[PDB]
A and B are shown apart, each in its own frame.
With several copies, the nearest count.
Chain A
Amino acid sequence: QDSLPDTKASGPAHSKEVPALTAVETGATNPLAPSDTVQTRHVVQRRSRSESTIESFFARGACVAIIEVDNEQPTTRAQKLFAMWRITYKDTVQLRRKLEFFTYSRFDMEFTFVVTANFTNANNGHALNQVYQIMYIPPGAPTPKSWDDYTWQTSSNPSIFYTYGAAPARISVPYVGLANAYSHFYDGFAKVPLKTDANDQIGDSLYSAMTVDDFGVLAVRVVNDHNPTKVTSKVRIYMKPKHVRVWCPRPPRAVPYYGPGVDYRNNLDPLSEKGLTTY
């Protein structure tokens, strides 16, 4: 059973006990119930808080990134025959805002990949079905310079080979943090400037940032050799935290995000105009 407390029948009062008065200066919220200030009937309560549990609140896969990758003839100028994405929940705003009601979190992560493609140009013949390789490159590993260089051999890095038209790809990741919890907020620096430093660039760091590469990158490419005609594809990444625990609640973001930190820039006016004595 998980239903909320029942309302007790409560009658008239004439007493020295005054629940209605209090002192919020204490730092405390007054524990009052309807029966403390009005006459109440007995209600056998059946409602429950099942859907507002931490797990239930986060139990939804959210779009955190759109990676675009092309499959076309390798010419000699900058192309997108492969692409890389730094893993984060911060390139998007919706899941970021939900996760940020809390300071610290701890969870396993579920990644689901939706892959769509289309023809770029009016006509040059067609394309046989494409297989996509999504490789995880953890910090330290060789990153690709080329869509078919040796790093794609993926001998120790995890890779997903996805076939177009197949059900959206899905993998699971453990809690992988260097700490006992993920910090949604870090009031500090990765380096301290010392008095004895040569230039004062040595000790400089970004405020709020921890490691430079955080959790690494996802390298995406089309394994197919190029057709005569060009195909453009988008890999959409859905993130779901599962087996979740959260600590130290925080006020929700009230103004538009301006980058990875807590910085704000404009639309600093969240609230509407309304008359003091207007319903």
Chain B
Amino acid sequence: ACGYSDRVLQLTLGNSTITTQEAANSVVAYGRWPEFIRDDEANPVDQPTEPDVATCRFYTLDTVMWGKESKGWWWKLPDALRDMGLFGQNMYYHYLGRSGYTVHVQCNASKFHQGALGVFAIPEYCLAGDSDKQRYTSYANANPGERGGKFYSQFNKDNAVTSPKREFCPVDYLLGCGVLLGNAFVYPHQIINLRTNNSATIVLPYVNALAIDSMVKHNNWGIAILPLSPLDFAQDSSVEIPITVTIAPMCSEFNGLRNVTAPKFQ
């Protein structure tokens, strides 16, 4: 009653609040809300750290621009948040950490623009690489942080054998991993179709073959945003609109405290 709607939402976590007046409901991956490790599913015996509001708030990543040649963007979690305030600090001070996430993707335009973004949350998003060499993508390259990576329209094999790039070569219609993109819809997702909605909101549970794991060694979720239908406006052949990704860690807990992990990203 009163005047409420599927399209209008407020998300509040910690000292952060998001409003949206043009949503398309919201997704909870596999019907499961984030939760803490139960005593009967626990494995590390040391008392956990639960930083709560200090880490379970919305961190906004650097904005990316969507233009007519944009092939697609990808992120990995927890990697995109490694440098985000006290969350990143907790991640690097402990051997173990689990966390769920609320992902909120933002992209508005006008009643006259056109285009549709496919936003997909993928458990264990193993991407493909550069080379003749199998499973050779270097740690530093596999992990772009906040920056994320991109998709390509075709497979360019990094030829230079002698001094290898050890990079991914994610081809768009193959979801960067040897399968057809049209089937990516079996994964938890939403579509930002500019005539319908400004944004997508997906709530991710912790998914893993384990109750808790090493966040520095392993990404649990991959976020893939691909243009299912290209951006278009009026007759202007060089339109560009911003895509902004805001993410919040949820029910975060950490085990195995010691000196801080300082990975080498060069």
Contacts and interface: CB of A to CB of B under 8 A. Distances in A.
A193 B12 contact: no
A42 interface: no
Interface string B162-201: 0000000001001101111001101111111100110000
B178 A187 contact: no
Contacts of A50: none
Contact of B178 (A17, A25, A209, A255): A255
Interface string A95-113: 0000000011000000000
Contacts of B154: 268
A16 B179 contact: no
Interface residues of A, number: 67
A122 interface: no
Interface in A107-158: none
A39 B264 CA distance: 32
Nearest to A185: B124
Contacts of A24: 191
A46 interface: no
Q: Determine the main DSSP class of A at the interface with B.
A: loop
Interface stretch (A54-62, A166-174, A259-267): A259-267
Interface stretch (A63-71, A196-204, A221-229, A234-242): A196-204
Nearest to B175: A251
Given A14-B203, A187-B76, A39 B53 contact: yes
B40 to A, nearest CB: 12
A26 B190 contact: yes
Contact of A17 (B10, B126, B138, B196): B10
Contacts of A193: 139-140, 263-264
A18 interface: yes
Given A14-B203, A180-B209, A208-B135, A192 B190 contact: no
Nearest to B134: A259
A177 B135 CA distance: 22
Given A251-B175, A252-B183, A15 B10 contact: yes
A206 interface: yes
B85 interface: no
B204 to A, nearest CB: 12
B216 A192 contact: yes
Residue in A186, A206, A263 with the greatest tally of chain B CB atoms within 10 Å = A263
B135 A268 contact: no
A12 interface: yes
B180 A254 contact: yes
B136 to A, nearest CB: 7
Contacts of A195: 262-264
B262 A196 contact: yes
Contacts of A181: 209
B142 interface: yes
Given A26-B24, A39-B53, A187 B8 contact: no
B218 interface: yes
B261 A264 contact: no
Contact of A253 (B15, B178, B189, B263): B178
30 contacts: A13-B11, A25-B193, A26-B25, A26-B27, A27-B25, A27-B191, A37-B12, A38-B12, A38-B17, A39-B15, A103-B124, A183-B209, A186-B124, A187-B124, A187-B127, A188-B219, A189-B218, A193-B140, A194-B261, A194-B264, A195-B262, A207-B135, A207-B137, A249-B186, A250-B187, A251-B175, A252-B179, A253-B178, A263-B135, A264-B128
Interface of A: 12-21, 23-28, 37-39, 103-104, 177, 179-183, 185-197, 200, 203-209, 248-255, 257-265, 268, 270
Interface of B: 4-6, 8-17, 19, 21, 24-27, 30, 53, 56, 76, 102, 123-129, 132, 134-140, 142, 154-155, 157, 171, 174-175, 177-180, 183-184, 186-193, 196-197, 202-203, 207, 209-211, 216-220, 222, 261-264
The 9 closest A-B pairs by CB, nearest first: A188-B218, A251-B183, A259-B134, A251-B179, A13-B12, A25-B24, A261-B135, A185-B124, A179-B209
